[PDB]
Design a protein around this motif. Structure first.
Motif, short mmCIF file in Angstrom:
data_model
loop_
_atom_site.label_atom_id
_atom_site.label_comp_id
_atom_site.label_asym_id
_atom_site.label_seq_id
_atom_site.Cartn_x
_atom_site.Cartn_y
_atom_site.Cartn_z
N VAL A 175 29.37 42.95 8.66
CA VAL A 175 27.81 43.28 7.55
C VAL A 175 28.32 43.99 6.38
N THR A 207 29.16 40.63 -3.13
CA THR A 207 28.63 41.29 -4.31
C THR A 207 29.58 41.14 -5.52
N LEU A 253 29.51 49.77 0.69
CA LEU A 253 28.60 48.82 0.32
C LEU A 253 27.72 49.28 -0.93
N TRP A 286 27.44 47.75 -4.65
CA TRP A 286 25.97 47.37 -5.26
C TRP A 286 25.92 48.22 -6.79
N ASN A 323 20.74 39.48 0.56
CA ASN A 323 21.50 38.67 -0.16
C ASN A 323 21.82 38.77 -1.62
C1 LIG Z 1 25.00 41.64 -0.61
C2 LIG Z 1 24.07 41.25 0.28
C3 LIG Z 1 24.65 41.20 1.58
C4 LIG Z 1 25.53 39.90 2.17
N1 LIG Z 1 26.29 40.10 3.29
C5 LIG Z 1 26.17 41.07 3.96
C6 LIG Z 1 25.32 42.10 3.72
C7 LIG Z 1 24.71 42.29 2.63
C8 LIG Z 1 23.86 43.61 2.32
O1 LIG Z 1 24.05 44.12 1.20
N2 LIG Z 1 23.34 43.95 3.28
C9 LIG Z 1 22.35 45.16 3.46
C10 LIG Z 1 21.71 45.22 4.85
C11 LIG Z 1 20.89 46.36 5.08
C12 LIG Z 1 20.08 46.23 6.38
C13 LIG Z 1 20.38 47.12 4.06
C14 LIG Z 1 21.06 47.17 2.83
C15 LIG Z 1 22.20 45.95 2.73
C16 LIG Z 1 20.74 47.95 1.71
C17 LIG Z 1 20.55 49.52 2.15
C18 LIG Z 1 19.48 49.40 3.41
O2 LIG Z 1 18.67 50.18 3.85
N3 LIG Z 1 19.89 48.24 4.22
#
Ligand code: A1IDQ
Ligand code: A1IDQ
Lengths: 493, 493
Positions: free
Chosen positions: B113, B121, B166, B170, B453
């Protein structure tokens, strides 16, 4: 040419809430003055927190799901803005007269500049209402994703006295375009044209509560808007000093969204290969327009050394013939400053210029015994460390500086906490693009000054503001983006 | 499947400024802990105001006109982001191990994840850099008008401990995409993966001073960033409470641009036509993912009353089988909470739920082992007035409410100062679109939960934040718009 409306009645002097004219909760009324004479024009109902609270309730009900304003076709919001433009055009002379009487603006300039801007602003945004688009997005995974651009909600708006009616239009047009409701507070000095607009809003057929107009003072009505927990968004135009308080209040209260259009100390750069006479006239207007009471004022004119002496001479000649007088008189180029407080601040800054060794070429004094008129004032041999080179004067005071090289002038122009506008005059394409690209300013003019248009975004770098108004980008401040992500059984491109 | 890096050593423990590893100015260090064991992992150099000041100076110099970073082709900024993605992919297991050790995240989940999100990203924003477009505008008058979208300048970024790496991605990805420079402050609990990213940033070949990484505490290093007069823009992810302080500090200092990603109490609405096998699992993950330490947590599950009892039964079954244990164990679903303070906060709110008469179906206690582990906890018969229904728990605590009508559940879902996300589970198209359109939330899921996403924007309504991250719209927070208006001799269409 048009003439000031004879025997102008001030019909609208009450608070406008839910399309009804209301007395203040306190019962108080406040005086409104003519800056050309110092005499009282009328009294206006004095809004305070109690009145703001009623207005927010009205705006919130008007924004409720299933309301007339929420259910209306976007195209019909646009039609209402177009209708408002039609009514302003019909009443253009009355409104210009009011701006002249109350605001000190020469009537012909209020008619041909301010009122033109108001009409064009409403007509421009009328066209955007049904053209605000979200997106569909080719996201990873088995999803359908789109965005929904929605109005934010209740928008509080606070506007200044230097462009009362025009700033009213700049604020309400994009807000309404996007489907928000509004609580707007005109400056204490200049409520009248805003209240007249209430009558036109009712006549145009806006649903009750969509626009509420709350005349009154800053610590009462203004502060109540800034700290209100039922207002979703605030837009403020005014001094950088008060802008800081707005942002602070937003953070302390309910994290309402904020945009700020604030002050400037904007540079105007004249190269020796510019059209000289044109540059002199443009730089003159660039600082003296609207009694010097413009955030866009080109209050640091940097002139290339080889044309400096001539530029100064021609500028002084132009300032000496600039006609200061009664706003209603068609010969008048320059009316009075807005009030005694501003008048005194300008005189004190002029004295600072003399004290710090700037060359007073002409002016420097008040004119007459009544109202708040000041001589067109020109300082030459201004240097960057001087108070007059750093502090926004907001009066008829031109400052002329000298420079030798493009690298030097770029550095000096940018060495400011402000960054609202800038300009460069040159016939050389390379110089024009190099300078304009390098400026830390939200609008840069090439071979012009004070060229504003409804189609073009406007706002500050640095401490001149946050966000943009006008153009498409003005709308971005007035919508909230929602992403909707739908699981689907199988995706194909 | 991948395995956690054996005997992981922490190589990078220093402040990263101008692509060099530096000790704190004070000489002070702070400890970093493993939340599964409570044991100290390492010590890290403690950044304070003096270190922030140095970092801002480095970031400012790197942003100077004519610098390598400013002169670079936009496409080459993009290539650097793609290179950084390559390096993260190379070191994916190391970084996932670090996130597991430091953050308490189950290793396989951090790998599949968090690290996936990081890589995606960077690769997404790599593609945007040379596709950020201004406009040319058909303005009134004899003018040529265009806009330049420029980087803002020095961007201060403050990120939380719940998604250390992560959230680092971001933040820096859109900032760098747009050509800004960065001073970024990881959470004091979780600095390690951010510092490793410093090593990869240098290896990727970013110019010195473009990214500066400042490990330290909130009231010291964080506050220094928020109030810094040489920082143009701040982005903060964290609690609403601290978000308010950020906005206030921006107002008091230099009116730096502010975006906030704050808390939630997000509704997850289940209609009776939903597939229960699917909806129960999605709602379970929606609240329990990442130890419940998600802003997106679906912490108010509203279930249509005809399926409420069955939904609760199924939810309790699932919670009772949820495997809590060592993050490195591949069978572990749930690791520890981040620290003792959070652990205590969660237990206090659980106690409040019992005291206010919510039905504790399972869990409710610490697991009584080393580290900060809490039993997966389910409350039913939760009502809207309860503390647990209003306050963000940020722990493994599921709350299940009943509703009867669509009108009712929309009102109850929206009756919140928060508005980060929402979901609706139904196969009825009319209900799905009515509910999703009516939600006051920045992301609404239909028939899924926690589907994020790189391509789709994300952020809060109301007090869940201001502005958006991810997608195209994420870039809008990281550019300043300049209008350039050129006088021309004659205009033709
Ligand atoms: C870049 C998108 C992505 C793609 N593949 C994998 C992961 C992601 C991604 O960012 N996921 C993600 C999942 C959750 C559950 C949350 C957040 C981010 C932001 C903070 C929060 O509270 N919840
Ligand atoms: C709507 C554009 C427009 C069109 N026709 C006529 C007028 C306008 C218009 O707004 N003009 C305008 C002129 C100046 C000098 C300023 C401002 C506005 C904003 C405040 C400020 O300091 N300066």
């Amino acid at each position: 040419l048009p003439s000031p409306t004879p025997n102008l009645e001030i019909k609208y002097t009450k608070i406008f809430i839910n399309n009804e004219w209301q007395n203040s909760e306190s019962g108080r009324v406040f005086p409104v003055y003519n800056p050309a004479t110092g005499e009282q024009v009328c009294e206006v109902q004095e809004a305070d927190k109690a009145d703001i609270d009623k207005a927010v309730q009205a705006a919130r009900l008007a924004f409720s799901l299933g309301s007339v304003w929420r259910r209306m076709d976007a195209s019909e919001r646009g039609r209402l803005l177009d209708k408002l433009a039609d009514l302003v055009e019909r009443d253009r002379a009355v409104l210009a007269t009011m701006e002249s009487l109350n605001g000190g603006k020469p009537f012909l300039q209020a008619f041909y500049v301010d009122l033109q801007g108001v009409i064009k602003t409403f007509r421009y945004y009328a066209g955007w209402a049904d053209k605000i688009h979200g997106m569909t997005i080719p996201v990873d995974g088995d999803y359908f994703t789109f965005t929904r651009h929605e109005p934010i909600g209740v928008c509080g708006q606070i506007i200044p006295w230097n462009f009362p009616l025009l700033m009213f239009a700049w604020k309400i047009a994009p807000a309404l375009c996007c489907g928000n409701t509004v609580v707007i507070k005109p400056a204490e000095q200049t409520p009248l044209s805003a209240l007249y607009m209430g009558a036109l809003i009712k006549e145009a057929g806006f649903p009750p509560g969509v626009i509420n107009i709350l005349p009154g003072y800053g610590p009462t009505a203004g502060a109540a808007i800034a700290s209100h927990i039922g207002i979703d968004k605030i837009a403020f135009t005014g001094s950088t000093e008060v802008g800081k308080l707005i942002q602070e209040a937003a953070g302390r209260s309910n994290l309402k969204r904020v945009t700020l259009e604030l002050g400037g100390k904007s540079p105007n750069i004249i190269f020796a290969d510019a059209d000289l006479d044109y540059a002199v006239e443009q730089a003159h207007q660039g600082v003296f327009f609207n009694q010097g009471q413009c955030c866009t004022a080109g209050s640091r004119i940097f002139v290339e050394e080889s044309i400096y002496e001539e530029f100064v001479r021609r500028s002084v000649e132009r300032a000496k013939r600039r006609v200061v007088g009664s706003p209603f008189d068609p010969t008048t180029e320059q009316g009075p400053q807005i009030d005694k407080k501003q008048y005194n601040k300008i005189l004190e800054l002029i004295q600072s210029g003399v004290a710090e060794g700037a060359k007073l070429e002409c002016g420097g004094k008040g004119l007459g015994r009544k109202g708040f008129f000041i001589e067109p004032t020109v300082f030459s041999n201004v240097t960057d460390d001087m108070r007059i080179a750093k502090e926004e004067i907001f009066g008829p005071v031109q400052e002329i500086l000298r420079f030798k090289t493009m690298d030097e002038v770029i550095e000096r122009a940018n060495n400011s906490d402000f960054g609202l506008v800038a300009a460069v005059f040159t016939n050389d394409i390379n110089k024009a693009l190099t300078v304009s690209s390098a400026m830390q300013a939200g609008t840069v003019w090439i071979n012009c000054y004070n060229a504003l248009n409804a189609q073009s975004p406007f706002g500050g770098f640095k401490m001149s503001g946050n966000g943009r108004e006008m153009g498409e980008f003005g709308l971005r401040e007035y919508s909230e983006v929602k992403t909707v992500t739908v699981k689907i059984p199988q995706k194909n491109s």
